Design a protein around this ligand. Structure first.
Ligand SMILES: Nc1ncnc2c1ncn2[C@@H]1O[C@H](COP(=O)(O)OP(=O)(O)OP(O)(O)=S)[C@@H](O)[C@H]1O
Ligand SMILES: [Mg+2]
Lengths: 135, 116
């Protein structure tokens, strides 16, 4: 059902994702005979037989948590991006300015509202190093 | 018993080369508010400044900025001799150099932004 009435422009070496069946699944477009990039027509025979391969160590996984796993808190996630994104995107420039950044951000709320999730998502999406201390 | 040995107090004016004096001390000391004075300090280090007037300034005290105060090796409550010197001429070549700690962020120009 994925490529039917879609004609999705694909390229050699891209990872794509399909949802359905109480599980998400990954694939990688390994080889195109009109190399490298094309549009999947009904002409294309699609080889789906073989071994599921290993990852490269710098392939960013899709089971990680990003900003699309969080719902219902648009405003607060905007505030945390404004506080945090600039001092971690541009450390050298921001050191060269001479302004102090924030250094202590206390998230609080009732139990079960997704605070560990928000911190994990900001860490994955900025790409900073992340160390977790548990109480 | 000389009227030129003076003692530093806190500064009110914001300039880096302006000292202040009260008017009877200037009139005794033969100074006008356009003069160019010479100031001696500890470890034989001296400085040159433009004097102006004040009424909130006392006679036993001179008011100077922190930049002049640190170029004389003087702290608050120390002794400094002042003397008029119209022996100051103009210049031809003046060679300046930044100090290494304050210039670690910016690179590029320094003449037109700062000194101009
Ligand atoms: N806003 C949200 N959007 C989507 N899923 C959420 C949200 N809030 C909570 N969840 C789900 O609830 C689970 C538990 O959330 P937590 O991150 O543990 O919240 P919490 O702040 O850790 O609460 P405590 O006090 O630590 S038990 C998450 O793993 C998500 O599956
Ligand atoms: Mg938690």
């Amino acid at each position: 059902p994925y490529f039917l009435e879609a004609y999705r422009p694909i390229r050699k070496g891209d990872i794509f994702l399909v949802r359905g069946g109480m599980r998400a699944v990954e694939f990688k477009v390994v080889e195109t005979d009109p190399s490298p990039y094309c549009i999947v027509a009904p002409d294309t025979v699609i080889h789906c037989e073989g071994e599921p391969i290993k990852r490269e160590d710098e392939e960013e996984s899709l089971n990680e948590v990003g900003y699309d796993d969080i719902g219902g808190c648009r405003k607060q996630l905007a505030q945390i991006k404004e506080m945090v994104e600039l001092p971690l995107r541009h450390p050298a420039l921001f050191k060269a300015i001479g302004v102090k950044p924030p250094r202590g951000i206390l998230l609080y709320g009732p139990p079960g509202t997704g605070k560990t999730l928000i911190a994990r998502a900001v860490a994955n999406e900025t790409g900073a190093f992340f160390f977790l201390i548990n109480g | 018993n000389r009227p030129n040995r003076l003692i530093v107090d806190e500064a009110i004016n914001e300039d880096n080369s302006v000292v202040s004096l009260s008017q009877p001390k200037m009139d005794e000391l033969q100074l006008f508010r356009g003069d160019t004075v010479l100031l001696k300090g500890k470890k034989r280090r001296e400085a040159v400044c433009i004097v102006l007037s004040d009424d909130t300034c006392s006679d036993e005290k001179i008011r100077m900025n922190r930049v002049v105060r640190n170029n004389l090796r003087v702290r608050l409550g120390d002794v400094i001799s002042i003397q008029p010197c119209p022996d100051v001429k103009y210049g031809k070549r003046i060679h300046v150099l930044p100090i290494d700690d304050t210039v670690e962020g910016i690179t590029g120009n320094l003449f037109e932004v700062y000194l101009k």
